[PDB]
Symmetry: T
Subunit: 160 residues, 12 copies
């Protein structure tokens, strides 16, 4: 009775600006994963084990987030681009030092990197939400996870 009598019903399509914003999020997530693995390998010093395990947890979370963002881009008829050259040439995260680093320096660096990653998502959020609340919810989840990880990492260096 209420059935729709057509055979071609097409889905929601993302705008190029929306795809660009999601690309901006994805590149930073991938770079965060790579730098987290770097710090996970080369951290050394007092209280080494806790940082060694927390950085692995952060890397797992960032990998899951990047996969979720790229699959959302695919679902919205966009084309993600996560190649190494593109990530290196278009990421906004500061470069990571190349040698062994103490735990305090690693804590500071990782906190700054997570803060930059969250800032990118916060800048993208209003424009994304103006079109797709479903994508805005994914952004909310990413922000929650990243901020929790940032707290758990930064609390080591607090003085009170």
């Amino acid at each position: 009775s209420a059935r729709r009598t057509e055979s071609d019903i097409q889905g929601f399509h993302a705008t190029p600006e929306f795809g660009g914003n999601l690309q901006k999020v994805l590149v930073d997530l991938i770079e965060l994963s790579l730098q987290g693995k770097q710090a996970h390998w080369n951290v050394v010093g007092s209280n080494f084990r806790d940082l060694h395990l927390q950085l692995d947890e952060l890397v797992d979370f960032a990998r899951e987030g990047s996969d979720t963002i790229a699959e959302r881009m695919r679902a919205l008829d966009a084309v993600p681009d996560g190649r190494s050259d593109t990530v290196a040439a278009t990421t906004t995260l500061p470069e990571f030092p190349a040698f062994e680093r103490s735990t305090a320096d690693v804590v500071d660096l990782i906190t700054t990197r997570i803060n930059a990653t969250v800032d990118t998502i916060r800048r993208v959020h209003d424009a994304v939400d103006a079109e797709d609340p479903s994508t805005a919810d994914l952004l909310h989840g990413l922000i929650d996870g990243l901020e929790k990880q940032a707290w758990l990492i930064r609390s080591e260096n607090r003085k009170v």
Copy 2:
């Protein structure tokens, strides 16, 4: 001090009839999607039969979970869901499925169209549902994104280069 309330019977949030009707529309489309997905799951045949067979079962599981969530939300908001077969058949908006064995390309086309119809209904309902209750709007967002991911995974088989 003491900030405790004295009232002994505090009542909860009650939904409006229009809100209940919108949730009923979403529920009936989810149920019809589950039934049609099982039909396609059984009667599909041809190339990539195994992949279509498994993906349609995943879609059916997702749709069943979504319909249960929507109906329980209506129950929590003091509404009465109606998921009877006669009501679903008479009030669903998805086009009817073909009766006999179908090739995999035809099944891909049909399932993509029906998933698109379901998400279109949810998107039509989302504005009023969000205006009344963002807690229910969150469930609507979850359904929309899950269904769109399933639609991508199913439709990508027929896409050319």
Copy 3:
């Protein structure tokens, strides 16, 4: 030495009457699943929780049974039809009431529905078994499960 010299060996094929009997079973299983979900949602009153959980168990069992029957139909070169219009127009289960119902009424209604579903299987059993004992075994399993569920549901209203 004893190897068969054939290149195409064909399997067992079901008769249209056998397919019709299995369709009769399948339609009632699907309608039972739908009515069980409806009662699961709309039940209310004393001893609400046990009915709420038992009806979910019954729905899971009925869904598994319908899938098994339809896959057996496919294996025997038959075509199941589980569309909503077909189920609504050809089911034998009585119609379910549309509003909130007390637990005693739900117990009575669900017991009646399960009894009708079992009666259909018992009616088609001899004709099915005359051709396919392998399908008769599936019918035996369905009857066992449905009767156990009916006992567990109906025992609530017993007075002794």
Copy 4:
């Protein structure tokens, strides 16, 4: 290269009003957990087992919700206060009776207290959403869960 230069990138901090609203939510969640445990221990009568198990599920949900809220406060650079004296002096939930109670009375009391807990979250939701949609999402999840638990508990005493 689009990499940032800043080496001390800072994060998002919450306002005192935001911290106060989250404290208002947290104290009610803790008090709900304590009262749920009390009702779980001291309930007697018909449907005792179902009430016993449902109240334990509600307590588990309230505990995880309070933990989530407090960790979000820590992530946003706020300081939660979940001490017994603070909860007792600042909670808004009505006081729970001290002796053994029948299941109908426990159902009424627990439904009332869950409704009060949900009302607090609904009161703070507008401001917390205007400041941080990421926290608004957590409060949406809390409201959904609490309302489902309220329905499951309260359906026992419905007449028809």
Copy 5:
């Protein structure tokens, strides 16, 4: 539509002879469980560990079989009676010795008792199958399991 009009469709009820046959099976299953536990505790000698574990497996199988039979009786509107006095007065298994026994004697005794238990089921099978193939299937499963356990236990004393 083909929906039924009746609102009080009744189920299948068992005859007193059917109930008696199922009681005959049930008492032997319970006695087999008790004697298996006795032999499990009081066995000594060579291959003690293997006998100790195999008898526990046999007891578990007998317990689940007795539960299945009694629940089938309940589903078919019969009343099982598995009290200690009834089992002791009406069982057909030979009495078990009261003290510590070597493994060869335990093997012989347990094999004889399993054979008697299987013989009872084979005696009642024809009538129970003529009445209810659904119950005949459960008895087929019981016979299969008991005979496999009997083989596994009895193979220890075989010469070559």
Copy 6:
């Protein structure tokens, strides 16, 4: 090497016949409790059937585990348990369980009485068992705890306040 004992065969602790009989009483009562719990589990009908149906299964599982533990302790202490049906029927102390279907209130009363009888037997045996072997007294403590919790969970249904 300095403190090593030169003994070639060191034997363990052996239980007296009084201790063996004290454990035999507990064993036969646990077995009879398991049998009566299964009977009540099968034949209970009436209002609130499901909760009692499941709690009786929990009680039967606990009683079976306890009887196995007691019999294995008897074996470890060089005693010979006797859990045969004739012995249990002739020497158990639990009152006989009635036949036919019973309502849930009657089943609650009967099961509470029989659990209390079992706990009373364990308490009577505990003094001598503890005076001889605290390791066995600990097992008795565990059994009393479990049985009393089961008794509370079962009897609270029929309470009136």
Copy 7:
């Protein structure tokens, strides 16, 4: 007041040589099916390679379990199974598998025909096996319907519209 049997040595059910031979036929066909399924699993190439690769592993697992069940039933009925390689090769009825790499369609056809041959053997044996022992006939029914489901899942790839 005692129905206990006096006989101290009670013997079980013994199978006939014809029954043992029928079960031997079923066993040897199951073993040959497992071997050929593994061969096809290794040597298949072409389109839908992954799907056939996984499905053939599932079929091989099913056939191995079925052969074990049949042989253990033979042992329980006081018969002696013979699953040696020479006996299987000299007495199996399945046509031999090709020696080299095969395409997907060829593997589908070959495996479908071999599964059909195995099911035909079991169906030929079922009448006598059921006439002697319905307990073994039940295992035969389980093998038949499992193999037919596997045959449907494998053969559905090559069907047209």
Copy 8:
């Protein structure tokens, strides 16, 4: 049948009001320990944050399980536990936990002191509890063991050798 008791209603062990208050003290101290453990878990900062953050969660879980066990034992022995927030705040013996963020050394000292206070309360009540019911004394032994192991694992951080 010969030794069966003819009693129709056998009642169980009942706890005295002194015993009930003795268990109430343990209950309120365990609840306050759980609350203060959660507070310290949230608000701890400084060097070696993660290990203390996780150990405090372990301590809170143990204390919650212990309080549940004590209250259920009170219910089984016909007593009425009182774990309301007002009662805990008014009648607990643990010293008040300071507010705001605290370094890890201060948290270690505070948590060690409060665990020691809880164990001291349990040790004070143990004599009378054991003199009345060894079954409850066993629960007290388990609580003391767990709390002392947690105290060692937490306090070992500040040891200087």
Copy 9:
């Protein structure tokens, strides 16, 4: 707040040197039992090899867990365990285990004797340990129960009836 203690540092229970030595004896015997159990597990041959091979692994796991529990209790009670190889070898009381391959009967006899020696040591220590700390006496009870069950399960192989 009314009953809160004003103490700023509350210390816990401390063990005496005699108590520490009483626990040290149990510790060294458990460690030596683990080492000899592994030795017998590796070097046993003869009839019924597999059952003894697996039971000795179970015994070794139990002894390792028990030694860890005892040492952690010593740490909790402010004692210092010493489980070094030289100390164990010089102060253990278990008789030396013979070298080379041994038959299963000899291994059964040796392992039974050494388990009995360990249990005898624990029983000798139990009186003073219980007189000082029932919480530690409970751990001793658990160890005695487990070791005696293992001894029964191992020694029952050589029984002749």
Copy 10:
């Protein structure tokens, strides 16, 4: 950059001699699996259960090893041949007796068969390793597992 400018890069290809040596290994693994199952079924006598379970473990290990070897052949562009006629006509293991056998005879036979299977691998090891250390590692694992299984089986008959 250091990126390679090729569109089709060839892999490692196995020589026919290497394929033949792996075929020699595979045939013996398959024959060992079949003979292990036969001994597992037909073993009987004292200590029956231990052999019954150890032979299952041996068969599982041999099946896994044969699958690994055949998949390595496929990866190295070779074609395995595991047909029944080929195995029967080209295996090196001695024929297995056709009837029920005591546990001592089964121990001797299985030990001999495992020794022959290990001897084949040891014979082909040097030639395999001269080309592919990656395949040599698989051979090492097979030898370790087979020798451990042989020790566990053969220790039953040891007299000291």
Copy 11:
């Protein structure tokens, strides 16, 4: 009677700069393989899309595990891995992946060639790595055969008869 060493600071094995460089080459190729595998996983479209989608995810997981293992081995051998994005992009040897959506056959070809390049690099490095440290050569063998199995499973899709 003591073979204990007197030296108080025994140092471990240290790798050479050439060894570190070879392991760095292996690591950078593994990282680039993971990135390109994820790219192909996202942007593959056409026939057999589901199988390619799942297999590429399996390959990415394997490559990630291998890169972690290699970097941890360098850390254990006192070397410093460098897995930064700029370094990977500037020093990897795998040819770059195309930018847009690609069909199934093209993805199969590209991934096969890149896996072959990675395993070729590992084979080039293996000789020196084995000459210095067989413990690291073992990890190299594991990487080689895992990657070759993945390459077979992926490339078999396009193979003809």
Copy 12:
């Protein structure tokens, strides 16, 4: 066919030098396990929890390694000797201190003892690999695991 005729094919037998080398490995593994447990119990100071958990992981690894070595010795027809007196008299690890130690001292001591254990295996590796590459593979795995544990432990005391 190609079937062998021999019925008593024998296996590979180890030389006394091989047995001595494996005994040298085994005694050091056992002593490492004992000293790891000692350090696990008696460690105090900063990062106590991390040292406590890492030493337990090291003890588990050493236990499984010693079991693997002894079972390989048994498979190769050798007789391991892991008695307490033998370990104490023939081990090469330095003696461990007897009282409570700070975490830095425990880190130094455990790193030294792990290095000695690895040096023993590296000393015996050439001969054991010249005789049996299958055993050389087990020693490769042991070396890899021990060196990873040594890195994870010593990284705590590294300056920068």
